[PDB]
């Protein structure tokens, strides 16, 4: 039903959470019939053209169709003031300072 | 160069595709405040 | 600061090169992080769109799709909105003999679309009849039959190369 | 020296980046042929995404 | 019925926009906190000049 108070409208489920108005999906019946169909956030399992039970999505083994590319940002880095010799050091490296003397 | 014999599949082993991940977003974007500066040493 | 209309003595370091390096690293880092991030974002969105292709490719030929999507050579079956999978048994190439003729001696006008083969699981095992499949797979049921047509020239993968047939004959 | 370092890293990063941009454009332009058959297979899913 | 120009149809993108922009050229000017001269003059007396 489109709304909670609307009339009940018949049909058949579609693919990926779709609702179809036409019940034309027909085939010859076959032995050993097992089917799964996506429903809400999980699945529904049917056997022999009869409802069997619901399944949570995590209950089914999931295989990755995606290629993992793991890009990690170059972290922030802080360069401290570093000097082999400070100005004063170089000033003091002189054996004598004329000013001080 | 190896062949394979594949038996008909059974409902015992069911696998499923991954749903799309929540794709990363660009960072907040640094909030830069323009200004005029005089650097003293 | 600007907006568009829209008692101690401080000792200063003698080298600005730390700050300049900081600026260089920050500029390069910001640029590489921005672009890489975009790459990563575009990568994720790329696979997010690719899944749309993958949902139909799995319907086209589930075996090949499952093989890769899982990582081992497996056969898959569409059971609605999911694929049932089963691992395939490896077989050496030397244990396969290709029958030359694909015409059916018992039914005129109908003949095999895909080469028939005789294969054995083990070097001493019994000889089992079947037909070759796509990308080096073995089918037990020889039901790939089509009406025979003039000008039949075909290649089929075999081992590490290909086998060529003319007029429903090797 | 910082000029040399920046120039070398910039030239390189720009090279591959531009190669990734070129390969990305080529990648889509290559994907459209896949998409045009996908849209025929199941127009709903591809349309929703496109 | 009739022919139509291509722009008459709404365009939907099957691409992924990957927007890579080149790292612009940058010039590092000679910058010194203190020049060789400033350091020489920082001394209260210079024996040479004296």
Supply the DSSP string of C60-120, one letter for each residue.
H-HHHHHHHHHTS-EEEEE-BSSEEEEEPEEE-GGGEEE-SB-B-TTSTTEEESS-EEEE-
Using CA atoms, how far apart are residues A54 and A72, in angstroms rounded to an integer? 40
The pair of three-digit structure tokens given for residue A49, joined into one six-digit string: 């053209």
Using CA atoms, how far apart are residues C8 and C85, in angstroms rounded to an integer? 77
Q: Indicate the burial class of B6 (C-beta count within 10 angstroms; 0-12, 13-18, 19 or more).
A: buried
Q: Which of B2, A39, B7, D46 is nearest to C56 (CA)?
A: D46
Q: Which of C139, C138, C143, C136 is nearest to C162 (CA)?
A: C136
CB atoms within 10 A of CB B21: 11
Sign for the pseudo-dihedral over CA of C47, C52, C58, C60? negative
User: How many alpha carbons fall within 13 Å on the CB side of residue C74?
Assistant: 23
The pair of three-digit structure tokens given for residue A72, joined into one six-digit string: 């990690």
Q: What are phi and psi of C24, to 5 degrees?
A: -60, -50
Q: Which of C136, A32, C30 is nearest to B26 (CA)?
A: C30
Q: Do A65 and C54 touch (CB under 8 A)?
A: yes
Resolution given for this structure, in angstroms: 3.3
Using CA atoms, how far apart are residues C150 and E12, in angstroms rounded to an integer? 44
CB atoms within 10 A of CB C113: 15
Residues 6+ apart with CB under 8 A from A17: A38, A39, A40
CB atoms within 10 A of CB A34: 17
Q: Which of C3, C77, C88 lies nearest to residue B5, judging by beta carbons?
A: C88
The pair of three-digit structure tokens given for residue C141, joined into one six-digit string: 């049921």
Task: Tell me the CA distances in angstroms from A31 to A22, A34, C77, D6, one per residue in order.
Answer: 25, 9, 15, 70
Instruction: Find residue C18's DSSP bridge partners.
Output: none
- For residue C17, the chain D residue with the least C-alpha distance is D2
Q: Do D41 and C60 touch (CB under 8 A)?
A: yes
Q: For Cα atoms A70, A71, A77, give the angle at the middle one, nearest 5 degrees.
A: 135
Q: Compute chain C's Rg from CA coordinates.
A: 31
Identify whether the C-beta of residue D14 lies closer than 8 Å to the C-beta of residue E23. Answer: yes
Query: Cα–chain-centroid distance for residue D40?
Result: 24
Helix (H) or strand (E) holding A92: helix A87-93
Residues 6+ apart with CB under 8 A from A79: C18, C19, C21, C22, C25
* Helix extents (H) in chain C: 17-60, 62-70
Q: Indicate the burial class of C133 (C-beta count within 10 angstroms; 0-12, 13-18, 19 or more).
A: buried
Work out whether strand C137-139 and strand B3-5 pair parallel, antiparallel, or are unpaired: parallel
Q: Do B5 and C91 touch (CB under 8 A)?
A: yes
SS3 category, B29: coil
Using CA atoms, how far apart are residues B38 and C13, in angstroms rounded to an integer? 17
Q: Where are the beta strands (DSSP E) in chain A?
A: 12-13, 19-20, 34-39, 42-47, 50-55, 61-63
Residues 6+ apart with CB under 8 A from C90: B2, B3, B4, C73
Q: Which of C100, C145, C98, C124 is nearest to B3 (CA)?
A: C98
Helix (H) or strand (E) holding A90: helix A87-93
Q: How many CB pairs under 8 A join A and B?
A: 23
Q: Which of C83, C48, C46, C47 is nearest to C67 (CA)?
A: C83
User: How many alpha carbons fall within 13 Å on the CB side of residue D40?
Assistant: 6
Mutate to test the interface with A, among B8, B13, B14 (most CBs of A within 10 A): B14
Q: Percent helix, strand and coil across chain C, each rounded to 5?
A: 35, 30, 40
* Helix extents (H) in chain D: 2-41, 43-49
Distance from CA of B38 to the nearest CA of C (A): 12
Q: Do E18 and C38 touch (CB under 8 A)?
A: yes
Instruction: Find residue C155's DSSP bridge partners.
Output: C164
Identify whether the C-beta of residue C64 lies closer than 8 Å to the C-beta of residue C134. Answer: yes
How many distinct helices (H) and strands (E) make up chain C? 2, 11
The pair of three-digit structure tokens given for residue D34, joined into one six-digit string: 């896949």
User: How many alpha carbons fall within 13 Å on the CB side of residue D39?
Assistant: 12
Q: Which of B35, A60, A68, B38 is nearest to C3 (CA)?
A: B35
Q: Which of C137, A33, C71, C56 is nearest to B10 (CA)?
A: A33
Identify whether the C-beta of residue C168 lies closer than 8 Å to the C-beta of residue C153. Answer: no
Using CA atoms, how far apart are residues D16 and D19, in angstroms rounded to an integer? 5
Q: Indicate the burial class of A92 (C-beta count within 10 angstroms; 0-12, 13-18, 19 or more).
A: exposed
Q: For Cα atoms C122, C76, A36, give the angle at the middle one, nearest 5 degrees.
A: 140
Angle between helices C17-60 and C62-70 (to 10 degrees): 150
User: How many alpha carbons fall within 13 Å on the CB side of residue C40?
Assistant: 19
Using CA atoms, how far apart are residues A35 and E30, in angstroms rounded to an integer? 74
Buried b (16+ CB within 10 A) or exposed e, C23-49: bbbeebeebbbbbbbbbbbbbbbbbbb
SS3 category, E21: coil
From chain D, the residues in CB contact with A18 under 8 A are 44
Q: What are phi and psi of E32, to 5 degrees?
A: -135, 135
Using CA atoms, how far apart are residues C133 and A1, in angstroms rounded to an integer? 47
Distance from CA of D19 to the nearest CA of A (A): 17
Sheet holding C116-119: strands in order across?
C89-91, B3-5, C137-139, C128-132, C116-119, C96-98
Using CA atoms, how far apart are residues C109 and C149, in angstroms rounded to an integer? 9
SS3 category, B33: coil
């Amino acid at each position: 039903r489109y709304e909670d108070q609307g009339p009940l409208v018949e049909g058949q489920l579609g693919e990926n959470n779709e609702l179809r108005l036409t019940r034309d999906a027909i085939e010859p019946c076959t032995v050993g019939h097992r089917r799964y169909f996506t429903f809400g956030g999980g699945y529904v399992y049917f056997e022999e053209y009869a409802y069997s039970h619901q399944l949570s999505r995590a209950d089914i083994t999931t295989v990755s169709t995606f290629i993992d590319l793991n890009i990690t940002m170059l972290e922030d880095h802080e360069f401290v003031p570093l000097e082999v010799y400070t100005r004063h050091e170089i000033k003091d490296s002189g054996l004598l300072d004329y000013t001080e003397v | 160069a190896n062949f394979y014999v594949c038996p008909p599949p059974t409902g015992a082993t069911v696998v499923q595709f991954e749903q799309p991940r929540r794709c990363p977003t660009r960072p907040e974007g640094q909030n830069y405040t323009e200004g005029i500066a005089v650097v003293f040493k | 600061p600007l907006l568009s209309n829209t008692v101690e003595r401080i000792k200063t370091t003698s080298s600005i090169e730390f700050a300049r390096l900081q600026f260089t690293y920050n500029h390069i880092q910001r640029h590489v992080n921005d672009m890489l991030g975009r790459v990563a974002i575009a990568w994720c969105e790329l696979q997010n769109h690719e899944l749309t292709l993958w949902n139909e490719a799995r319907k086209l030929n589930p075996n090949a799709i499952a093989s890769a999507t899982v990582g081992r050579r497996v056969s898959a079956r569409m059971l609605g909105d999911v694929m049932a999978v089963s691992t395939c048994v490896p077989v050496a190439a030397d244990n396969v003999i290709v029958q030359n003729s694909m015409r059916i001696s018992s039914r005129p006008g109908a003949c095999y679309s895909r080469p028939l083969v005789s294969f054995r699981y083990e070097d001493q095992g019994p000889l089992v009849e079947g037909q070759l499949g796509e990308n080096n797979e073995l089918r037990l049921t020889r039901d790939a039959i089509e009406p025979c047509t003039v000008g039949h020239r075909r290649y089929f993968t075999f081992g590490g190369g290909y086998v060529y047939f003319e007029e429903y004959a090797y």
